[PDB]
Design a protein around this ligand. Structure first.
Ligand SMILES: [Zn+2]
Ligand SMILES: [Zn+2]
Length: 56
C-alpha cells in the first residue's frame, strides 16, 4: 500500500471546493481568498497568517 498522507490540505476549510487555495505560514491548513474571516480579495502581501492561528 502507501501512506497516502500530506502535510497541508488541498481543499477550502469552509466550502470545500477545487482550485487555488491559500497556505498558512505556521499551521497546516488552507483557506480560500473569499472564504476568510475577515474575507479577502487579492494576494495578501506580507507574512500572512490564518485567523485560526492568531486566535486561541
Ligand atoms: Zn471556499
Ligand atoms: Zn495558521
Amino acid at each position: 500500500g502507501s501512506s497516502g498522507s500530506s502535510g497541508h490540505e488541498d481543499f477550502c476549510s469552509v466550502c470545500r471546493k477545487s482550485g487555488q487555495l491559500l497556505m498558512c505560514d505556521t499551521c497546516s491548513r488552507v483557506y480560500h481568498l473569499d472564504c476568510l474571516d475577515p474575507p479577502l480579495k487579492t494576494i495578501p502581501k506580507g507574512m500572512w497568517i490564518c485567523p485560526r492561528c492568531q486566535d486561541q
